[PDB]
Amino acid sequence: PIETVPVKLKPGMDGPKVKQWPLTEEKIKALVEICTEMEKEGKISKIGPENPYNTPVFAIKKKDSTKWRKLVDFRELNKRTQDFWEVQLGIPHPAGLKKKKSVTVLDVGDAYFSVPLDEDFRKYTAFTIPSINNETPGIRYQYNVLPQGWKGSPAIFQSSMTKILEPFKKQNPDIVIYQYMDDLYVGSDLEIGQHRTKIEELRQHLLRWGLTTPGYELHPDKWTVQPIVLPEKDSWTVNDIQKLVGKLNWASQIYPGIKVRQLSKLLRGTKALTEVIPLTEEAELELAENREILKEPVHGVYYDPSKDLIAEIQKQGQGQWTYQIYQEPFKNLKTGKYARMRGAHTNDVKQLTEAVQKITTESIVIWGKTPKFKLPIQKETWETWWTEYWQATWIPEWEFVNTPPLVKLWYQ
Amino acid sequence: VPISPIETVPVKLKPGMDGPKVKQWPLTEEKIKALVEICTEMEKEGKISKIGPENPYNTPVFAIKKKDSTKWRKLVDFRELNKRTQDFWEVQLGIPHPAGLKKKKSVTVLDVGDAYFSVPLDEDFRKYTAFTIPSINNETPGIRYQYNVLPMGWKGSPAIFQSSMTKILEPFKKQNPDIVIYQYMDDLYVGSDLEIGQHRTKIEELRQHLLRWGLTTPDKKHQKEPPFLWMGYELHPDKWTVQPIVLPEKDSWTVNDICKLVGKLNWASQIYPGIKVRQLSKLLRGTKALTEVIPLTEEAELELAENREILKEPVHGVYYDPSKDLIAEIQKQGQGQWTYQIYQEPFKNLKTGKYARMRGAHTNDVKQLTEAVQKITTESIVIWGKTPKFKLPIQKETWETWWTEYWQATWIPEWEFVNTPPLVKLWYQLEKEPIVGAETFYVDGAANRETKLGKAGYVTNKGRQKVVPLTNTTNQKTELQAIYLALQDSGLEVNIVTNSQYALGIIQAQPDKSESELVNQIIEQLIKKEKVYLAWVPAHKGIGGNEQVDKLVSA
DNA sequence: TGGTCGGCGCCCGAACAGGGACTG
DNA sequence: CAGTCCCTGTTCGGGCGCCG
Ligand SMILES: Nc1ncnc2c1ncn2[C@H]1C[C@H](O)[C@@H](COP(=O)(O)OP(=O)(O)OP(=O)(O)O)O1
Ligand SMILES: OC[C@H]1O[C@@](CO)(O[C@H]2O[C@H](CO)[C@@H](O)[C@H](O)[C@H]2O)[C@@H](O)[C@@H]1O
């Protein structure tokens, strides 16, 4: 007996109709067990083909969890409700979260199951469970409460959420707390022990309200950037200077102060690539000045809350991956590199999956948004394996690119 | 007043739209006889009801003879009613494969009598069914009828039946957790490890359960005894095979001929190893009339010959043993053709298949093998819910060299090398660093957008030079041509500097095959080299050799 | 006679997206 | 600084095979 906040799709827009993809035996068994308890608890109830809407479902294990977690891919539904959360009930983003020495992430999705869901909206949460070898037709469900991974669930629950938060917020007025989807981000500058302790107290607050909590520890102040860097060589071959001029020429699309003239002067003839070229004094200084400009920040790059974040990733090899986050081309809000991630030197898809997860997390902490990824992978390759390695409760938007590397700008 | 048997499914029309109206077909009197007897029979059951002209809806009707039977099948063309009926979400997510089935001591295959006609249609929606009956003459009007039950040819029939059937089935399944029931439309496959007498007890008891909801399983299509006929397969206690496939014998082939042929051979390739459709499909590309006659090349003929000979010997697959591993082995068949076998015990196949898809204008065997592995993995997960271990005709070091060096993320799941030739390899490797003592060719080409005329040429550190005129070309084609020239005119080791990103992108992905003959010739030369270093510089930067060759080809 | 529905598979071609290079 | 043209790759609907 609680009022159900009415929910509407964006205007002139129809519900998600997205085919369910094949699932492994372990994932189907996990979902069947999860859903059956959910049906008995009344969170979901079976439905039929009259409901034309469907969203894909699968299961994941969080890092070190060993326990199956139901994950619904609501990306299509969320875009069709996109106006609702941003315009009306959106959570504000604490610009201070990225500055905290430690930030812990808690899965509070279970709480959303408390509140019920608008009777008129439930038709859009439909998801089908497949069977191995198609022994059975699809077992369809729909949600009676606030679904985990929908963008309405934190927004509608925010009024309830803040009241539960309000005692703890007043007992620790400098601890920053942020809510993105099923997760609670809790940052503090305390020492490690105090921080983890304070985390338990927040867990107790949820417990008395009746929400079970199963957390990731971040350190946004540790987070660094990966600037463009020019090599350091005792002697320079023609090929070396040719590589350098092309890099610099591309870099000049970002830092307009780059100059190649004095370095081009070294290439004047028609020379063998391995011929050694001494650098002139004028080139040495031009190369010096450039190395400084690349330390500098780009002119007039700032975040625009209206624009979308775009993330690009490059596979550098030997387990090394570089990324840039931006909104307008060549104006990069952040650039970074990852190395020695899980699956390094054995599995590219696992490494790409990890990197996507890390980058998304950083963007949530920093801008409170997930970027749209440009993924350096074939579409068929990614779709086959990505769910195997996914350990997160959200799913960003992505697209697939094939751009071979004319220049190694981002990584030496 | 009629009667209600099992729970119905609400079915609205699409909003602001109204029921079907369209006049009946000029049905031949011979067909007309069959419907009248059946339709009158339905009314006594309560499947159908008469309607006064207060029902202003008409939709055509026809019928086809039941295959392998004297009976006739009764189809209501609902194309306009579908158009205006609400969309459903199909619950049929695929087709069951026999290789998925575990071995069962006792198996029963039984069919439901009049499947769609035992399932009530939505009460409010019943009005839209209306169709006009026909007579031997045009004098007698014929009665108007509205279905009280799901009708064949509606776009909502399959999903409603499948969802309704599962709801009826579920209570029984919960009661008997150890029975396997494969439910596909109205065909039910029941398997148990119960001894045959006990199994039939459950089988009959299941028949009673379906009876309670008005679902009738006649003895007429009840299979107590092997070999069972199920989903186009013949099921035996320890093995299965496809029901025999007849390939047309025609001496002269039309277009429609090859399509049927091709589509049969694809069905055959799930068990028969090594089926090849490449050359038979070559005959179908860019043809106008389905009726048009087409002659078979000596390629499509030879192919078709070995395809028929494979069918000569009977083959069979086995069933799935969850205890043992799944194994997929792949062979390269040439011309972008791959076949594979999935098995558990050596030489006892669960199923076979082929991957022939040509993806990309320029590609290599390693990319295609990766594609075939992915297709097998997804197929395996559907049938068995797990990924097979892979046996691949590619050296462990070849794969390591490819994937580490490629700029795209690529991966193959757990696999081992099998030394069955032809082995898959990279035909050439580009050097990471410039080659000392090798001649450096600065290459470029340009072409005039209007004339389609162009030049391709190179300049080198030794002073070697060439420029060649070309006709009916493009900038892209001349940049490739420039590279081809440097390869032709160079020794076994050569450094090439281009400003063409297009060409560099093609070549760096180590293609061994291309739709472009020019790229094939470049490949041909790359394979003959000992060392090639390709490097890129930006055009119009006044750099070195590149500027000079740029002037020559621009002229 | 020619004619319905849903599912899955293949191979095809056409229509569409988008990224560089070059043209004014 | 737009507007093309190349060239490539994706999508989608058509035919057929197969199952109800
Ligand atoms: N060619 C078709 N067109 C439309 N629907 C079909 C067609 N074939 C089969 N179906 C549907 C309707 C049937 O009720 C259901 C089962 O097929 P089927 O068993 O062959 O006929 P049937 O069950 O109605 O008669 P029977 O029990 O005597 O075989 O699948
Ligand atoms: O990966 C693309 C592929 O994913 C699907 C279904 O999973 O679409 C989902 O992912 C897209 C890319 O993020 C979203 O834009 C879309 O909303 C979501 O349904 C397929 O539709 C698509 O082919």
Ligand SMILES: [Mg+2]
């Ligand atoms: Mg039947």
Ligand SMILES: [Mg+2]
């Ligand atoms: Mg040029």
